[PDB]
């Protein structure tokens, strides 16, 4: 189980499973290890990782799916992040 | 004064409009459902209006601006767009009278 | 069932996923993969409570109820440097900025 | 269209199990094409329905009118009753592409007019007045069928 280093505009290291982290359409292009951002802070990046975790685990599975929670202020910050990282 | 003759002739067109396959569209919106009959509706439609409630304000003398009525007519269309769904003819009918109304206003100016 | 966690240490954050069933050392073998650091040079924490290496995740609070993928549990990690250990440190995540005046 | 109800007049008792956190709205597509706004079930509520076989139901959050799954699928046709046991319709929300889940928070928190007063990337302001529609997502399903059939 491989893992990649995602780094933000505050040096915040994010080790997330390479398969979970490949769910991004934009990150996928730069793979087929050390990815860096600047428009993206840390509080958004952890939430994007939390979406990555979630997606794989509840995608395709016929079991009932929980509610994804977005903090009001992080919502726009994440709206352009989901735009960029292409969900 | 003259406004009340304009406003009548304006709304009368829409009211008297029979569609492309021969049948009045407006017929539905003329009278809003009864209170106890469709309560479900009213909660969402926090501002209800029927074509008879416009005809009222004209007859009585309320919209002392010709634009004042357009602002009210657009509300009947909004309420109808609000409750009703895109697909159902009730929704696809508000749009007609909404384009058609401004064409009966294009008639005056 | 499962558990999803954020192994937070300073600016570092490691998002793995064990089993409700598993214990403390079992996670350290995962870390001994990501960082490749040995478990004895690893001091696992939760609240500031230094776990075990053979204590079940369900027992220590980690259930399917509180370790959700979109709400992962923070598991802080201290490190050994010359027999003596280090203080547990995690630099917090950047504060979500001001809420827009149309959003308020 | 290719999607509408069937005036079979053959009854079949349904039960709207709502395993979703939203105010789930049923939409029965009448015999020609008119989507119908049937009463709403809050999270949990399992109201019984006296629908028919060949009829069509779809589900949306009552405020946004978003996409809900009814038995891990978009649409729902009730099967004819068996053993005197009513046919279930367990509802849940999918796994949305983050943009949609965001646009839900965003469209819900910003009022219809103020959608452009905000501080965002230009390309997004337009994805906002893209409120999930029924006719859109259905004639889009009708499109995906003749893209396999």
DSSP calls for C54-93:
SSBTTTTT--SSSSBTTBPEE--EEEBSSSSBPPP--PPP
CATH number at residue D103: 1.10.750.10
**Domain check: are D19 and D75 in the same one?**
yes
Can you tell me the distance from the alpha carbon of C100 to that of B17, in angstroms, rounded to the nearest whole number? 46
User: Which domains does chain B possess?
Assistant: 1-109 (1.20.920.10)
What are the strands, taking DSSP E only, across chain A?
A: 3-7, 13-17, 34-36
Contacts of C45 (CB under 8 A, 6+ apart): C51, C75, C76, C77, C78, C88
Listed by start position, the domains of chain C span 2-103
Q: Best residue in A73, A75, A87 to probe C by mutation, most C CBs within 10 Å? A: A73
CB distance D91 to D59 below 8 Å: yes
**Domain check: are D35 and D69 in the same one?**
yes
End-to-end CA distance of chain B: 17
Chain C and chain B touch, per 3+ beta carbon pairs within 8 A: no
The three-point CA angle C24-A12-C75 to 5° equals 15
Can you tell me the distance from the alpha carbon of A34 to that of B18, in angstroms, rounded to the nearest whole number? 67
User: Which domains does chain A possess?
Assistant: 2-87 (3.30.710.10)
Can you tell me the distance from the alpha carbon of D120 to that of A26, in angstroms, rounded to the nearest whole number? 19
Q: Residue D59: name the closest of D147, D126, D7, D132 by CA.
A: D132
Total domains, chain D: 2
Can you tell me the distance from the alpha carbon of D16 to that of D24, in angstroms, rounded to the nearest whole number? 10
Q: Which helix (H) or strand (E) holds D109?
A: helix D98-109
Using CB atoms within 10 Å of the CB of residue A70, give its burial: 0 to 12 exposed, 13 to 18 middle, 19+ buried. Answer: buried
CATH number at residue D51: 2.60.40.780
Q: Say which residue the tokens 């993969």 belong to.
A: C33
The resolution, in Å, is: 3.7
- Backbone CA torsion sign across C58, C63, C66, C69: positive
Contacts of A72 (CB under 8 A, 6+ apart): C99, C103, D105, D109
Can you tell me the distance from the alpha carbon of C67 to that of C87, in angstroms, rounded to the nearest whole number? 25
Question: Considering the domain boundaries, does residue D124 fall inside one?
Answer: yes
Question: Hey, which CATH number is domain C2-103, 3.10.20.90, 3.30.460.80, 3.30.590.20, 3.40.50.300?
Answer: 3.10.20.90
CB distance D5 to D30 below 8 Å: yes
Can you tell me the distance from the alpha carbon of D68 to that of D92, in angstroms, rounded to the nearest whole number? 6
Method: X-ray
Q: Say which residue the tokens 């058609």 belong to.
A: B100
CB distance D30 to D55 below 8 Å: no
B83–D134 C-beta distance less than 8 A: no
C71 Cβ under 8 Å from any chain A Cβ: yes
In terms of residue numbers, what domain contains D25? 11-92
Query: Looking at chain D, which residue has its C-alpha nearest residue B92?
Result: D34
Taking contacts as CB-CB distances below 8 angstroms, the residues of chain D near C103 are 109-110, 118
Q: Residue A55: name the closest of C73, D19, D99, D68 by CA.
A: D99
D103–A80 C-beta distance less than 8 A: no
Which chain D residues touch C if contact means CB-CB below 8 Å?
Answer: 109-111, 114, 117-119
D73 Cβ under 8 Å from any chain A Cβ: no
For D131: left if phi > 0, alpha if psi spans -120 to 50, otherwise beta; the answer is beta
CB distance B14 to B21 below 8 Å: no
A76–D19 C-beta distance less than 8 A: no
D102–A78 C-beta distance less than 8 A: yes
């Amino acid at each position: 189980m491989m893992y990649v280093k995602l780094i933000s505009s505050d040096g915040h290291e994010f080790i997330v499973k390479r398969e979970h982290a490949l769910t991004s359409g934009t990150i996928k292009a730069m793979l087929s290890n050390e990815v860096n951002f600047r428009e993206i802070p840390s509080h958004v990046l952890s939430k994007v990782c939390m979406y990555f975790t979630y997606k794989v685990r509840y995608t395709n599975s016929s079991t009932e799916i929980p509610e994804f929670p977005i903090a009001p202020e992080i919502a726009l910050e994440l709206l352009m992040a989901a735009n960029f990282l292409d969900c | 004064p003259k406004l009340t003759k304009q406003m009548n002739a304006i709304i009368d067109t829409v009211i008297n409009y029979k569609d492309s396959s021969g049948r009045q569209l407006s017929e539905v919106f003329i009278q809003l459902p009864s209170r106890k009959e469709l309560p479900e509706y009213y909660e969402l439609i926090r501002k209800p209006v029927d074509f008879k409630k416009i005809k009222e304000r004209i007859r009585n003398h309320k919209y002392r601006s010709l634009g004042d009525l357009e602002k009210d007519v657009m509300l009947l269309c909004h309420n109808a767009q609000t409750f009703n769904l895109e697909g159902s003819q009730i929704y696809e009918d508000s749009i007609v009278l909404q384009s058609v109304f401004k064409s009966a206003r294009q008639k005056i100016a | 069932m499962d558990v999803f966690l954020m192994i937070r240490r300073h600016k570092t954050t490691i998002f793995t996923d064990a089993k409700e069933s598993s214990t403390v050392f079992e996670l350290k073998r995962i870390v001994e993969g990501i960082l490749k650091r040995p478990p004895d040079e690893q001091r696992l924490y939760k609240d500031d409570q230094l776990l075990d290496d053979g204590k079940t995740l369900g027992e220590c609070g980690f259930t399917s109820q509180t370790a959700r993928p979109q709400a992962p549990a923070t598991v802080g990690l201290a490190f050994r440097a010359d027999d003596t250990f280090e203080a547990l440190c995690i630099e917090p995540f950047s504060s979500p900025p001001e809420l827009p005046d149309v959003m308020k | 269209p290719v999607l509408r109800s069937v005036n079979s007049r053959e009854p079949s008792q349904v039960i709207f199990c709502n395993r979703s956190p939203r105010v789930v709205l049923p939409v029965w597509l009448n015999f020609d094409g008119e989507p119908q706004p049937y009463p709403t079930l809050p999270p949990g509520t399992g109201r019984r329905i006296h629908s028919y076989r060949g009829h069509l139901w779809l589900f949306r959050d009552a405020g946004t009118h978003d996409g809900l799954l009814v038995n891990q699928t978009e649409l729902f046709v009730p099967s004819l009753n068996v053993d005197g046991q009513p046919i279930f319709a367990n509802i849940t929300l999918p796994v949305y592409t983050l943009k949609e889940r965001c646009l839900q928070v965003v469209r819900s928190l910003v009022k219809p007019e103020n959608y452009r007063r905000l501080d965002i990337v230009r390309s997004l302001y337009e994805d906002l007045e893209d409120h999930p529609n029924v006719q859109k997502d259905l004639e889009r399903l009708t499109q995906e069928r003749i893209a396999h059939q």
